[PDB]
């Protein structure tokens, strides 16, 4: 109880935050019908470092930052080899949200649906195109991209895994 949380908020230049949806989810009780706020926060620096997080609380801002503290303990790093794009195409479903990611030329800003585009514009990739096949959901969507960019391999570690010395690569 020292006060004002100035040093303790950690001013968040390192991780920039945004919501991607704040739906009010509600439960009914004996007394009636009371609601809490479920916010989904995607945290990440533009270095290649993102992760989702849900939260719910009766306040809006405590749900956002509570989802952020859930989010900033959930980070993967993005395998993004070239001039801020992707090594190869990928698809990976989670639940019932399927996400096709596809690398792009460098003259192409990120084009995807709002959750996928949110976790990629926070991922610092600049050149991708990801269609979403399946759900209208936002959480399983974004988390499906996170699973869809964990399982993604560069050329250096595939060259290391196969044992092949090196060729067949322009750069």
């Amino acid at each position: 109880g020292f006060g004002s949380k100035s040093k303790k908020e950690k001013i968040r230049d390192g991780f920039e935050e945004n919501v991607v949806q704040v739906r009010r989810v509600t439960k009914v009780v004996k007394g009636g019908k009371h609601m809490r706020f479920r916010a989904i926060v995607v945290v990440g620096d533009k270095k290649g470092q993102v992760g989702v997080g849900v939260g719910k609380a009766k306040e809006v801002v405590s749900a956002v930052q509570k989802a952020a503290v859930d989010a900033r303990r959930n980070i993967i790093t993005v395998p993004m080899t070239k001039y801020l794009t992707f090594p190869h195409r990928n698809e990976a479903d989670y639940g019932a949200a399927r996400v096709m990611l596809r690398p792009a030329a460098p003259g192409t800003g990120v084009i995807a649906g709002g959750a996928v585009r949110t976790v990629l514009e926070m991922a610092g990739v600049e050149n991708a195109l990801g269609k979403q096949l399946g759900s209208n959901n936002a959480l399983n969507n974004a988390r499906a991209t996170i699973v869809a960019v964990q399982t993604m391999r560069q050329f250096s570690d595939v060259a290391r895994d196969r044992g092949i010395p090196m060729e067949e690569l322009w750069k």
């Binding site: 109880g1 006060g3 004002s4 949380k5 306040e59």
Partner: protein
């Protein structure tokens, strides 16, 4: 519904204010005198500081009658804001308070004291959230602002209830936030509360502040 703390704890840990001991017809007339003194002081400082800038926050007006002489103590938090600098503030208070007590021409000493920490005194803090909330500022920014504004100034537990018609609504609500222990039932516990009514433009608001010290 719930009993209010300053009523509930009167035998112990909370003392009365209008501290003069009398007989029935003289009790009614002494209560006349008390109410007109609190009227003249409240309306006085409200006028002569409404022209001035900020809020004053007069918490307690204790009135005591030892002899035919009336000690009046005024417990505001910001007492330098009042006076016209030689002492002429309290002098003109003493003029207008002498205007409505001179049945028996008995002397009265209007004093003024400092609140120890003005954020921790619920009438003053309730006046702050009243003032900011009467300006166009949301419930959340102003109310959390009152909370951290309080906990920087050393308060054990706090409860804030703001009543209906918050920023733009036609359905009344109640919104209360609590931190720490506020045991309203513990008789020893010494909770001081205030219940200020904010007179806004699109309605009336009600602020009720409990402070556990």
């Amino acid at each position: 519904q719930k009993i209010n703390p300053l009523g509930f704890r009167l035998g112990t840990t909370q003392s009365h204010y209008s501290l003069w001991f009398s007989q029935p017809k003289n009790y009614a007339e002494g209560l006349q005198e008390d109410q007109k003194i609190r009227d003249c002081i409240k309306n006085y400082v409200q006028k002569n500081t409404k022209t001035s800038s900020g809020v004053e926050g007069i918490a307690r007006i204790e009135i005591q009658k030892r002899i035919d002489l009336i000690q009046v103590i005024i417990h505001m938090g910001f007492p330098k804001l009042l006076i016209e600098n030689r002492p002429q503030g309290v002098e003109d208070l003493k003029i207008n308070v002498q205007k409505e007590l001179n049945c028996v021409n008995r002397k009265l000493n209007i004093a003024i004291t400092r609140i120890a920490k003005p954020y921790g005194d619920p009438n003053i803090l309730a006046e702050f959230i009243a003032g900011q909330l009467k300006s166009r500022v949301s419930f959340r920014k102003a109310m959390k602002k009152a909370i951290e504004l309080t906990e920087q100034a050393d308060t054990k537990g706090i409860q804030i209830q703001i009543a209906g018609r918050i920023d733009g609504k036609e359905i009344a609500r109640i919104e209360w936030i609590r931190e720490g222990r506020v045991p309203l039932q513990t008789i020893r516990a010494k909770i001081d509360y205030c219940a200020y009514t904010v007179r806004t433009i699109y309605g009336v608001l009600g602020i009720k502040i409990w402070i556990f010290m």
